[PDB]
Amino acid sequence: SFEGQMAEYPTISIDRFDRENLRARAYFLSHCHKAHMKGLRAPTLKRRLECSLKVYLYCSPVTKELLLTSPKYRFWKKRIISIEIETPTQISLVDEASGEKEEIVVTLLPAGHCPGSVMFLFQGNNGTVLYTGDFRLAQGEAARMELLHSGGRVKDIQSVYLDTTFCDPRFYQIPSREECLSGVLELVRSWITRSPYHVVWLNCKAAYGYEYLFTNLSEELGVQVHVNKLDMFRNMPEILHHLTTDRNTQIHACRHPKAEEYFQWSKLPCGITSRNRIPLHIISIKPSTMWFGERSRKTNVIVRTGESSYRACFSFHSSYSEIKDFLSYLCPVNAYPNVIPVGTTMDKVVEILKPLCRS
Ligand code: NI
Ligand SMILES: [Zn+2]
């Protein structure tokens, strides 16, 4: 599995900052998710940064903004360099122990996974490689990325290091971003327009990536979404103004350790149960990955699980058919899975991808 280092450029570390990654000539962060930040504020890394002065962290503008809203990562401020999207950027790497100098060009491509999420395309003197980070690309999106191409064909890519979360034929198709959004929108609309006392709880994981759902709901329905904390979007106006810390709203995305018990007793995680002593009428909506097989057809993005509860199709990652389409299009020499799906093995995932690769 992926532990920070690509074979072709081992002196850079991406989305992993412990163990062998402590000797990196440069760091890269694809997106601000805990699973891709292992060791990023460890004492040993800080120790190492005090020694090595020409070591930087590179990421997208949004990732820089998000990361540094957390006090615990503020020590990175002096060493963090953002790179604009789809803007090829020369990066110089120097050996601390040896004398060595090394030059690479990096291009950030949007990953469709959460605010600030990118893929990193690296070009240097040891071939071109693509690190996808976490991604969801719909069909046709890769073909529109001009900087994946050279002279009207895809660039010669030696190796792709890719998000294989749903790389198993069972996860053949997943409804699109737009389909998922429209389903949730119409469910919420149909509830909250009944009266001011009808409210929705969006039961979401504690992670970036639900913001486009919140913004669309807010934009379409003229309501702000209750969240526990929104200071990370202080400088992000197109997100911030769709959120609120006030409990007096019809759409909630607040969180609590016992939030599901609270919902079973008609509460809501933030504790509001009534207004003018009228009980709030609450439905829960849990964004959840849903998929259909190769020989099946799409069914409703909304799944009712109780009188007052729903699951709603939502995915942070590409389907199997999207992964195969992406890799087929890239046609690299090698493809390496970043992640093994829960019910599969590395050998099955590698062999799924192998026919789409040149060696
Ligand atoms: Ni992620
Ligand atoms: Zn709330």
Author numbering: 3 to 361
From the article:
Artemis (SNM1C/DCLRE1C) is an endonuclease that plays a key role in development of B- and T-lymphocytes and in dsDNA break repair by non-homologous end-joining (NHEJ). Artemis is phosphorylated by DNA-PKcs and acts to open DNA hairpin intermediates generated during V(D)J and class-switch recombination. Artemis belongs to a superfamily of nucleases containing metallo-β-lactamase (MBL) and β-CASP (CPSF-Artemis-SNM1-Pso2) domains. The overall fold of the catalytic core of Artemis is similar to that of SNM1A and SNM1B (2 Å backbone RMSD); it has all the key structural characteristics of human MBL fold nucleases, with the di-metal containing active site at the interface between the MBL and β-CASP domains.
We crystallized three forms of truncated Artemis (aa 1–361) with substitutions in several of these metal ion co-ordinating residues, i.e. D37A, H33A, and the Omenn Syndrome patient mutation H35D. The overall architecture of the three variants is almost identical to WT Artemis. The D37A structure crystallizes with only one nickel ion (M1); Both the H33A and H35D variants exhibited loss of the M1 ion. By contrast, all three variants retained the Zn ion in the zinc finger-like motif of the β-CASP domain. Mutation of Asp37 to alanine results in the loss of the second metal in the catalytic site, likely explaining the loss of activity, although the first metal ion is still present. By contrast the D37A variant has similar thermal stability as the WT Artemis, suggesting that it is folded in the presence of a single metal ion in the active site. Our D37A, H33A, and H35D variants lost the ability to digest DNA substrate in vitro, in accord with results with full-length variants. Thus, whilst our results support the importance of having both metals for the nuclease activity by Artemis, subtle features can influence MBL fold enzyme activity.
